[PDB]
Amino acid sequence: QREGINASARYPKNWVTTGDPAREFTMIQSAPLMLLADPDEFVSVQLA
């Protein structure tokens, strides 16, 4: 929200902690919700 970029596919975020222990980070966040416009179009045939 600070960049107003919540709405996206992926999300990079690189950041570092302060203090005596100095250490950085790399970050990705995302939210896939893959869909099908025609759920009944495909037939899953379970072979046997």
Binding site: A37, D38, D40, E41
Partner: protein, 47 residues
């Protein structure tokens, strides 16, 4: 109230239809100005 829930789906997936016979057979159409219609036929058949 904070439940907008936008969508983008209006799937039809509803029909399978093509006559093709009015196009295979009925290529010619004829409007009428007549209340009734005749349609005769002559058979040819000799000994």
């Amino acid at each position: 109230m904070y439940t907008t829930a936008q969508l983008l789906a209006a799937n039809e997936q509803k029909f399978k239809f093509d006559p093709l016979f009015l196009r295979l057979f009925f290529r010619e159409s004829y409007p009428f100005t007549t209340e009734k219609v005749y349609l005769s036929q002559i058979p040819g058949l000799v000994n």
